[PDB]
């Protein structure tokens, strides 16, 4: 098998987790304890020089950074009935690259603060939640989902009329947003709600969402 | 040719600019004025729905997000004497993916604040610079370049013993860091200084660094 280092709870781990469950590869999730500073430990720095989760072992190959790990997985285990990067078609490719990078640079940075603040703060590491920061991040996110509604009224998926890495990347952080009080926000954006429910009801996503409780 | 929308001054534009000058493709840089809010204008939203620079036109193909644009360019114009993504070798590939994503998630976020604050603030948009934020970002960056020195003592480039996209990604923001008072920081990190000067003295980089003044 291949080894994935981090808690399953973790969103950046779920990212990699899912990409394996979509490509029906055999894998083990070796946990890492944050309370024990296991991720700063010397065993882990031999995987990730920056001592963050997740990392990845394929025999004598050692990989960090959830999106580089995911590409690598998807390229390696490419069936004809599962090409979620579309490297054959150069233009389909570009439109997975573009919505992969909307998640990392536009969507996640507007959404991730509402989770952390409404959820990681109180549930983990029990500090309070900042009205100032949740309120701002919502407005920021409302005007971002205006573009998603537009795109997801023309296409069934961000990339085109097919599931891609770009769809999957949006799964882990969005899944935790769905447990905040503000999860009814997506109701107001029906074509995005539609695309959500389409993702939620894949077999692979149905599995991994087990591993997030 | 192909059209790249944004000021050449711009770092995310330089990213795309360079990738074309490395692959000897024919291109025009159509400018966009920030003072006139040209990037929020309706012509531009037809390129980038989020009304940020840069965007990209290859005939009837419209692309945003400097790193997705760059992949697309590099894949498209792939000679045998210029494969800066290494998609043939799956493992070389992964090690361009990993250091591409170190720039976006670890390096840039520690370095970009020292530029913006020491340079964009006073030079552009004339507000002051925050000691609190420059001081912190340096410490953050010193412990990041400790990993770069280690990696660049084993290999000549981040990826392996070859120039890659991962090397190029580090160019634009680092080039502006080189004009702050703190540019002598890299002196303390000789193998990184070495790798810098190796990049600085390519023909393509020698051109694009013209287009950043
Ligand atoms: N953005 C990176 C890293 C994600 C990340 O930093 N993970 C967190 C999980 S809570 C972590 O390890 N934080 C602890 C630390 O960075 O010290 C990726 O692509 O995986
Ligand atoms: N990170 C994105 C976008 C970079 C970006 O946001 N560019 C700036 C250049 S100053 C911009 O357009 N800022 C104005 C705005 O976003 O409103 C990429 O991969 O190109």
Numbering used by the authors:
A (entry chain AAA), B (entry chain AAA): 3 to 215
Lines quoted from the article behind this entry:
In black-grass, upregulation of a phi (F)-class GST1 (AmGSTF1) has been shown to be a functional biomarker of MHR. Recombinant AmGSTF1 has been shown to exhibit both glutathione-S-transferase activity toward xenobiotics, as well as acting as a GPOX, reducing fatty-acid hydroperoxides to less reactive monohydroxy derivatives. The Phi (F) class GSTs, of which AmGSTF1 is an example, are found in all higher plants, being homodimeric enzymes in which each protomer of approximately 23–30 kDa with the catalytic serine residues located at the interface. Each protomer has two distinct domains; the N-terminal domain adopts the typical thioredoxin-fold, with the C-terminal domain being a bundle of at least five helices as demonstrated by the crystal structures of AmGSTF1 presented here.
In spite of extensive crystallisation and soaking efforts, no crystal with any substrate bound or any alternative crystal packing forms of the wild-type protein were obtained. Based on a careful analysis of the crystal packing, the key hydrophobic contact stabilising a crystallographic dimer interface shown in Fig. 1b was identified and three protein variants were designed to facilitate alternative packing. The core structure was found to be virtually identical to that of the native protein. However, the previously disordered loops in wild-type AmGSTF1 were now well-defined in the Phe112Thr variant and, for the first time, a glutathione molecule was determined as being bound in the G-site, confirming the validity of the design strategy. The Phe122Tyr variant therefore adopted the closed conformation for the two loops over the binding cleft with glutathione bound in the G-site.
